[PDB]
From a paper:
We next targeted β-strand 7, the most structurally heterogeneous region of Aequorea victoria FPs (avFPs), to engineer variants with further enhanced stability. Introducing the S147P mutation that was reported to improve thermostability in violet-light excitable uvGFP21 yielded hyperfolder mutants with considerable resistance to 1 M sodium hydroxide (NaOH) solutions of pH ≥ 13 (we were able to determine hyperfolder FP extinction coefficients by collecting alkaline denaturation time-course data). hfYFP-S147P/V206K/L195M behaved as a stronger monomer in the OSER assay than did hfYFP; the L195M mutation originated de novo from a PCR error. We named the hfYFP-S147P/V206K/L195M variant ‘mhYFP’. mhYFP further demonstrates that diverse stability-enhancing characteristics can be structurally engineered into FPs with minimal perturbation to spectral properties. The V206K mutation (on β-strand 10) largely preserved the GdnHCl stability of multiple mutants. Using structure-guided engineering, we conferred the NaOH resistance that we first identified in FOLD6 into hfYFP and enhanced hfYFP’s monomericity in one step, producing mhYFP whose spectral properties are identical to hfYFP’s. We tested the same FPs that we compared in the other stability assays and found that none could tolerate OsO4 concentrations used for CLEM except mEos4b, hfYFP and mhYFP. We subjected eGFP, mGL and mhYFP to a modified electron microscopy fixation protocol (4% PFA and 0.2% Glut, followed by 1% OsO4 and embedding in agarose and optimal cutting temperature (OCT) compound—that is, polyvinyl alcohol and polyethylene glycol) and quantified the retained fluorescence.
Author numbering: 3 to 64, 68 to 231
Write the structure that this text describes.
């Protein structure tokens, strides 16, 4: 039922309101998602001028509903089953030897468009660290995100470490703890243990004047025998 909303290409709107060490910023993005092929593309633009944090640190915050679930794994796709009323996606992201983000997003249909509307707060960052000092490379590594059922809350949980490449070599770890809960009252799918395999490519639109990120992601569910 929820899954039937994703058989074709779905327009996406992303809106983020952010505040990191008191520096406020807003991002607005548009794009399209193709769950059949496990892919999405977004062009994300700062609407407040130069962003105060590196774009790669916002990649995970800025749509697991577009994962491709293989035919033998369809009964494990919580994310589409919560549609169209949607789900809340909440995270704490702890940056090693630095500050943390807290995010709350609602992912839901508004008419024909899938919207991801986020509030992000960042606390306790070092003015000289890799984040506020902009020392992270403009790229993104592949990661596996493990999904577990959270039956008591009718939702799912995930925790995973993101490795950000640092400009002069080295990595900056960002430890993510995530909880997703349905917005509606209707039944959702509680999944067996599996994971989502993510690939992400960051680029720039050479003709765009504003601070921005072009994000292309490929996401495939995996890990269930058969």
């Amino acid at each position: 039922k929820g899954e039937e909303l994703f058989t074709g290409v779905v327009p996406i709107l992303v809106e983020l309101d952010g505040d990191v060490n008191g520096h406020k910023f807003s991002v607005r993005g548009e794009g399209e998602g193709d769950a059949t092929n496990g892919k999405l593309t977004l062009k994300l633009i700062s609407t407040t001028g130069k962003l105060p944090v590196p774009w790669p640190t916002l990649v995970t915050t800025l749509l697991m509903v577009f994962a491709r679930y293989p035919d033998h794994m369809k009964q494990h796709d919580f994310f589409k089953s919560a549609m169209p009323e949607g789900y809340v996606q909440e995270r704490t992201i702890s940056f090693e030897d630095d500050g943390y983000y807290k995010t709350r997003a609602e992912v839901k249909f508004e008419g024909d468009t899938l919207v991801n509307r986020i509030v992000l707060k960042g606390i306790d960052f070092k003015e000289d660290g890799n984040i506020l000092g902009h020392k992270l490379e403009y790229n993104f590594n592949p990661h596996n995100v493990y999904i577990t059922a959270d039956k008591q809350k009718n939702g799912i949980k995930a925790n995973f470490k993101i490795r950000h490449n640092v400009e002069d070599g080295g990595v900056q770890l960002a430890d993510h703890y995530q909880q997703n809960t349905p917005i509606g009252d209707g039944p959702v799918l509680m999944p067996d243990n599996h994971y989502l395999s993510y690939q992400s490519v960051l680029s720039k639109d050479p003709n765009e004047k504003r601070d921005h990120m072009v994000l292309k992601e490929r996401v495939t569910a995996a890990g269930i025998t058969h």
